Amino acid sequence: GGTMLKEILEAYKEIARTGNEREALLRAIDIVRDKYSEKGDEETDTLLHRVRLDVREGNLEHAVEDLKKLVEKRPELKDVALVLILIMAEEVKKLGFPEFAEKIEELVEKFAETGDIKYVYAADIVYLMALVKKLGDEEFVKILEKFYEKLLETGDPVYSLIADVILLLAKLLKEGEISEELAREVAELLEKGDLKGVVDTVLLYYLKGEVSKEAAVAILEKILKVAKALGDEELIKHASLAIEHVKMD
Amino acid sequence: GGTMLKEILEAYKEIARTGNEREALLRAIDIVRDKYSEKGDEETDTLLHRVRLDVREGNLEHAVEDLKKLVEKRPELKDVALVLILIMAEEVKKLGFPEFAEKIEELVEKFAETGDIKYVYAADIVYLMALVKKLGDEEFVKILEKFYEKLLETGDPVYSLIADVILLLAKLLKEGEISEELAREVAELLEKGDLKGVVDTVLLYYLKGEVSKEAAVAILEKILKVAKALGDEELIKHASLAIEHVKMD
Amino acid sequence: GGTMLKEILEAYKEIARTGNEREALLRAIDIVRDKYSEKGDEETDTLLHRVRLDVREGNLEHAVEDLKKLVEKRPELKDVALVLILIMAEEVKKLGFPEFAEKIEELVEKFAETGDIKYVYAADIVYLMALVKKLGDEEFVKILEKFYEKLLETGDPVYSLIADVILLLAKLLKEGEISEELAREVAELLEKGDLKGVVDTVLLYYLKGEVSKEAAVAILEKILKVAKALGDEELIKHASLAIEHVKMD
Amino acid sequence: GGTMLKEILEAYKEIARTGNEREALLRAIDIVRDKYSEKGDEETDTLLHRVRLDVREGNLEHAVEDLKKLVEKRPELKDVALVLILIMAEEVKKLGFPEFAEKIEELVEKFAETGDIKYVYAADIVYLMALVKKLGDEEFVKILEKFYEKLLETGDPVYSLIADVILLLAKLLKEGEISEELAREVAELLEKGDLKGVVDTVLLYYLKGEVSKEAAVAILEKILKVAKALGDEELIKHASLAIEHVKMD
Ligand SMILES: [Zn+2]
Ligand SMILES: [Zn+2]
Ligand SMILES: [Zn+2]
Ligand SMILES: [Zn+2]
Ligand SMILES: [Zn+2]
Ligand SMILES: [Zn+2]
Ligand SMILES: [Zn+2]
Ligand SMILES: [Zn+2]
Ligand SMILES: [Zn+2]
């Protein structure tokens, strides 16, 4: 938090002055891996090996995916979060949206001289609006932006999960899965204040025969994940009953 | 021990006659991985994958680190030890010290036609000497040389741990951590016969306010690791009391 | 508390009008022993027997010692406390300090028409400064006086324990044990606010080789006793680690 | 053992230069009681109180009895042993045998500059021959002298128990109990090497109707105590069967 983190960012800046934008990331990964290899941390060493290999390959999306997994299970690591956000920003620059890249750069600058994971979550959500904008839907970006604004003033780690659910809805909307009406209804529900009515809406559309069993199960599992990080038991039971009804019945 | 080991060294010699010094190591790693993949050994297969990838990359130090971890946890594997020593020799040749390279080459020659892990430990300690000489301190090399001489005539696997502690002292001496006086005192203590007085000296300097909590703790768990392979309970308890005092108090 | 206590003091005053100052104490002890013998209290009857025998002998110091023990383990008894305060009052009159005797007399007068053990503790500490002044050190009396003032306005039973520690320091200072510098440092530490720094100072001087194992153990167990009546677990563990390091190592 | 014991003996010598021979013992007891009262040792403090009271009374025999009990149960304490031997010597001088007084004085002189309990046992046995000589029997003194000679060259704490058995035999011989023949037989048996034959002889005389149930039982538990400090299970069982036969049958 302000120490041993600004050094990594500084080194990334020096190696990025050339403009390669790829070797600086590798050097940062190598710095983090040296620190986590001297300890008895093999799970982090292997994961950083895989991340470095993927980054050198060019498949950064898988790297951000499993790094997101790692930071979610164990968020005590902060340098790992820093290199994660660096990769997220670099991938955003590749995607073709420079304003999101600038926002993530400011988030990195503020997080390096701080130590709060809420900036990590905010950058993750910026990446999610970047992906949504790449997908084609534009109206979804508004709710993501509202969540990003609300996170920088609340610091609730539960907001990113809702944005993940929105990303799942956008992904399903494109392949040929659940129609637009359900997507808009669920987006509005998660937008205003609604998490319980989302379950009821999903069940209603499933019974009426508008949603296949796989999509409903995926959305309800995401809702259950959101509810499990909120300390709500009247909604965990409600989602459990919903999924149980959906799968076998 | 004299069989199925001299074959690997012979093949490394044939492929090294070209002078590439990189592909022969890869071929040896591939020979070892084939033998350990035909079995139900996935922990060795993955580690050899990582080692081969690192060797092809050129970051041999991480490979020697995790191979050292593997051989310390599992000393029964001897071909893995052989390729380990080959990697140490190749890295030493890169570092710029040819005399240490010659010494470790003779160690490989003797170990191939034998089967004793004490040569592996001796080569490791020669590596640590190489690293210390690269760091800048020269007086530390004398104690390492004395330990290396004593290991070839005793075969006690605990001598490498003391050299590892010396390497840690040298590393801390360079970054900006604990001053020279403590380093010299601890080096002399581990040199002559002293392991218990080292703990007392570290505690004394901690209480007087000359050593930060991190470096003292590091040296203390290193001493605890040294004592845990010596069958000493009067020193394990002493080190445990020392660490408990240092961390929370 | 104001009843069945003022009667004993009144009788002591009547029998002390003659001026023998020895038989009145015996009569008070016999009054207390009659009351505690009619019950099923044998541990008190025997102890009062011993106290009366010692008082008639003239060795009041042993009597005040074991009566202090008794009142510390079981402070519900108040008449026993009253005769105890009478005993240090008489002993102080023998020692040659009349002002301390006057202070103890006022404390007896206030305690008889009250019932608070804090006056017992205050008179105990007065006895402590009397003994300290008899020993020869004068600077130690100031901290004892400060503790005496602080007890009459706080009523915390832990203040007498610090005075006991100061007494131990003064006693060790005279025989030929720990030098003056450590005594002054520890006195200042216990004076201002420090109990944790005392342990560190004692350990530091032990490791440097200025204090024999017996004196350090005595001071540390006294500090442990002080901390055990303060509801502190971060200091009980700290003192336990200190003593464990000191004795066996 | 050579320290903080010679000081007590020196003080006893100074106070005994007057020739009172009674107040020096009281001063030594008071020194020991001060040391054992500062601790949490109430069992030793009370017993020293009783010993001092008995010594001032003039009934030293009870004091030596319960001090013997104390040193037998817990012989780690050595100063109490020193004051015990001092009381033993003083009582010997009162009895009227100056040669035994000289012997025990030399024993005190050697024990003070040493620390071995075998001198305590030797002085105890000297007291036993003194008591036997006072009783009237003279032939019994020879076996006691032989045991005393053998103890100073063996250091076996089991020899004093046999002398205690001899003392019991002498005591029973005088009141009107068991006749001389059994006493001589048992004395010879205990003298040469016999402890098992003593049990058989006692049982034989009991069955023949020469010894009442009380004296036989007394000698039998004395023999059992002797055998219990010898690590013999073939004799403990033999004594247990003997006592069981004697009491109920
Ligand atoms: Zn690795
Ligand atoms: Zn519902
Ligand atoms: Zn149904
Ligand atoms: Zn594989
Ligand atoms: Zn009584
Ligand atoms: Zn401490
Ligand atoms: Zn120590
Ligand atoms: Zn007492
Ligand atoms: Zn028999």
The DSSP line for A139-200 is HHHHHHHHHHHHHTTT--TTHHHHHHHHHHHHHHHHHT-S-HHHHHHHHHHHHHT-SHHHHH
CA of B181 to the centre of ligand 7 (A): 20
- Is the distance from CB of C68 to CB of C98 less than 8 angstroms? no
Q: Which of residues 163-182 of C touch B (CB under 8 A)?
A: none
Q: Is A236 exposed, middle or buried (0-12, 13-18, 19+ CB in 10 A)?
A: middle
Contact present, D and C (at least 3 Cβ pairs less than 8 Å): yes
Put simply, the answer to whether B245 touches C241 (Cβ < 8 Å) is: yes
Give C-chain residues touching B248 at CB under 8 angstroms.
Answer: 234, 237
B123 Cβ contact list (under 8 Å, min separation 6): B85, B88, B89, B104, B107, B108, B111
* Alpha helices in D74-179, H assignment, sequence order: 79-95, 98-112, 117-135, 139-151, 159-175
Residue D140 buriedness (CB in 10 A; 0-12 / 13-18 / 19+): buried
Look at the block and give the residue holding tokens 């002889």.
D201
- The separation between CA D150 and the C-alpha centre of its own chain, rounded to angstroms, equals 16
Residues with CB under 5 A from ligand 1 (ion): A 45; B 66
CB-defined contacts B:C, below 8 A? 33
In this complex, do C46 and D45 lie within 8 Å of one another by their Cβ atoms? no
The two structure tokens encoding residue D25: 């013992």
What's the resolution in A?
3.2
Quote helix, strand, coil % in chain D, to nearest 5.
80, 0, 20
Of C122, C118, C82, nearest to C100 by C-alpha is: C122
Alpha carbon distance C103, D8 (integer Å): 38
CA distance B214 to chain A (A): 13
Distance CA D226, CA D161 (A): 6
Q: Number of residue pairs across A and B with CB atoms under 8 Å?
A: 14
- Report CA-CA distances (Å) from B159 to B107, B119, B140, B142, B154: 17, 12, 15, 14, 10
> Which is nearest to A110 in space by CA: A138, A81, A135?
A81
Touching partners of D (3+ C-beta pairs < 8 Å): C
Interface chains of chain A (3 or more CB pairs under 8 Å): B
Q: Tell how far the Cα of D4 is from the centroid of ligand 8, in angstroms.
A: 21
In our burial notation (b when 16+ CB lie closer than 10 A, e otherwise), range A171-181 reads: ebbeeebbeee
Angle D21-C50-C120 (CA atoms, 0-180°, nearest 5)? 125
Spatial separation of the C-alpha atoms in residues A160 and A100, rounded to whole Å:
16
Query: How far is A53 from A63, CA to CA, in rounded Å?
Result: 9
B212 to chain A, any CB pair closer than 8 A? The answer is no
CB proximity B207 to A under 8 Å? no
Residue A11 near residue A31 (C-beta atoms within 8 A): yes
Residues of C in contact with D53 (CB under 8 A): 53
Interface test with B, best of A35, A49, A54 (most B CBs within 10 A): A49
* Cα C107 from Cα C98, distance rounded (Å): 14
Rg, chain D, Cα only: 19
Test C59 with D30 for CB contact under 8 angstroms: yes
Beta carbons of A53 and B50 less than 8 Å apart? no
Distance of CA D183 to the CA centre of its chain: 19
Question: Which residues touch D29 (CB under 8 Å, ≥6 apart)?
Answer: D48, D51, D52, D55, D83
> CA torsion angle for D82, D84, D86, D89 (degrees, to 10)?
-130
Task: Kindly provide the b/e burial profile for residues D187-218, where b requires at least 16 CB atoms within 10 angstroms of the residue's own CB.
Answer: bebbeeeebbbbbebbbebbeeeebeeebbbb
- Helix A23-37, helix A42-57: angle, nearest 10: 170
Q: What angle do CA A212, A216, A222 make, to 5 degrees?
A: 155
Q: What single DSSP character describes residue A209?
A: T
Interface test with A, best of B44, B45, B59, B225 (most A CBs within 10 A): B59
CA nearest neighbour of A49 among A78, A76, A26, A21: A26
**Residue C43 in contact with partner chain D when CB distance is under 8 A:** no
CA–CA distance, B106 with B102 (Å, rounded to integer): 6
Q: Rounded to whole angstroms, what are the CA distances from B212 to B9, B219, B249, C101, C228?
A: 46, 11, 12, 52, 30
Rounded to the nearest whole angstrom, what is the distance from the C-alpha of residue D202 to the centroid of ligand 9?
Answer: 9
How much distance in Å is there from the Cα of C42 to the middle of ligand 5?
7
Chain D interface mutation, best of C45, C48, C59, highest count of D Cβ atoms under 10 Å = C59
Return the structure tokens found at B203.
Answer: 């505690």
Q: Is C65 on the interface with D (CB under 8 A)?
A: yes
Which DSSP helix (H) or strand (E) runs through B11?
Answer: helix B6-16
> What are the two backbone dihedrals, phi and then psi, of residue C152, each rounded to the nearest 5 degrees?
-65, -15
Tokens matching residue A98? 């420079």
Burial of A228 (0-12, 13-18, 19+ CB in 10 A): middle
Q: Which ligand is nearest to the CA of D234?
A: 9
Q: Does C53 touch chain D (CB under 8 A)?
A: yes
Taking the alpha carbons at both ends of chain C, their separation in whole angstroms is 50
Residue C164 has which token pair?
């006991």
Beta carbons within 10 angstroms of residue A231's beta carbon:
9
